[PDB]
């Protein structure tokens, strides 16, 4: 059982994402208002997909006030208080030098854990951490943050988010 839905983008038709809010089931891709140069989100069919046939590509053309202004959040993430989950995802970038934070938190924005400010290379890597649901929440979120200025001009690819009981 996986806590998150559509973790590998296989539920979504290929193409540029034109409905950030609802166009990728299991995810919210809304952009913060402080961003003035829009990013591009695209579900890509590709033979190097770590799983299945699709990945999500995020082209960062500019940043805003906080790195969370360019983001992909998995939701809902269905969990149980007390349980420790393993988070795993695959990521790479068009150019070495990209930076991503992989986070999990509640609908209050309190975080349970993160992998902070990770360097992303041109080759796929698994990024993994454990976290415990430490409050009473059963429906949480998994925000991925791309809006670091180091990413401007780059494209970050993600696939295979799986949040699983340890
Ligand atoms: C967390 O602290 C980090 C710290 O930032 C690091 O520097 C450090 O080393 O580690 C700690 C954790 O151990 O920071 C989170 C934000 O991180 C991102 O921005 C800051 C940057 O330094 C960092 O690199 C980057 O990853 C923060 O979560 C954010 O919380 C925002 C709300 O903040 C309040 O409530 C939670 C409290 O903890 C804070 O003190 C309060 O100010 C929240 O902002 C809201 O975002 C809305 C949009 O949301 C959607 O898009 C962004 C997605 O992240 C989100 O899932 C989507 O739903 C917007 O509409 C609101 O107006 C805005 O307030 C951010 O979404 C959330 O990511 C952690 O709380 C904090 O512990
Ligand atoms: Ca996939």
């Amino acid at each position: 059982l996986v806590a998150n839905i559509n973790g590998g983008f296989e539920s979504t038709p290929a193409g540029v994402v034109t409905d950030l809010a609802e166009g990728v089931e299991g995810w919210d891709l809304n952009v913060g208002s402080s961003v003035t140069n829009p990013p591009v989100f695209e579900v890509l069919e590709t033979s190097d997909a770590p799983e299945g046939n699709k990945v999500l590509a995020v082209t960062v053309n500019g940043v805003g006030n906080n790195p969370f202004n360019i983001q992909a959040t998995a939701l809902p993430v269905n969990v149980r208080p007390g349980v420790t989950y393993t988070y795993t995802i695959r990521a790479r970038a068009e150019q070495d030098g990209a930076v991503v934070s992989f986070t999990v938190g509640n609908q209050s924005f309190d975080e349970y854990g993160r992998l902070h400010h990770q360097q992303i290379t041109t080759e796929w890597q698994p990024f993994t951490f454990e976290f415990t649901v430490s409050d009473q929440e059963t429906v949480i979120r998994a925000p991925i943050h791309f809006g670091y200025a180091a990413n401007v001009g780059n494209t970050i690819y993600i696939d295979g988010l799986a949040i699983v009981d340890l």
Side-chain angles (χ1 to χ4, degrees):
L1 182 64
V2 315
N4 59 295
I5 69 159
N6 198 25
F9 306 101
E10 304 300 308
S11 303
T12 305
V16 169
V17 182
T18 58
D19 180 348
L20 299 176
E22 301 178 316
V24 182
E25 68 186 85
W27 294 85
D28 169 2
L29 305 181
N30 284 320
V31 179
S33 61
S34 67
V35 176
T36 63
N37 195 335
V40 181
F41 291 90
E42 183 172 3
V43 173
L44 290 178
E45 305 205 45
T46 175
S47 54
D48 88 319
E51 69 86 60
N53 302 308
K54 290 167 174 169
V55 309
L56 185 70
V58 183
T59 302
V60 177
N61 293 312
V63 298
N65 302 156
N66 288 284
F68 62 75
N69 298 154
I70 301 173
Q71 62 89 24
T73 295
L75 78 173
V77 182
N78 292 154
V79 296
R80 297 176 62 69
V83 173
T84 301
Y85 296 85
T86 303
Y87 178 116
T88 310
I89 197 171
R90 309 304 228 252
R92 70 172 199 92
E94 193 71 15
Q95 184 203 353
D96 283 331
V99 174
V100 176
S101 294
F102 303 98
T103 84
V104 284
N106 66 25
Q107 292 181 61
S108 305
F109 308 116
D110 306 309
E111 277 173 24
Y112 305 110
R114 62 161 61 203
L115 281 170
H116 184 63
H117 199 283
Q118 298 294 286
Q119 293 290 319
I120 313 301
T121 75
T122 63
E123 296 187 14
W124 290 105
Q125 285 189 82
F127 294 90
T128 187
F129 65 100
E130 292 174 6
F131 66 95
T132 301
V133 178
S134 55
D135 61 13
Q136 280 178 298
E137 299 300 297
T138 57
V139 179
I140 71 166
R141 301 273 185 81
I144 308 174
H145 300 156
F146 304 97
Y148 296 94
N151 294 340
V152 174
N154 211 340
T155 299
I156 301 95
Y157 307 89
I158 61 165
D159 199 14
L161 177 64
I163 296 172
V164 184
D165 178 353
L166 180 59

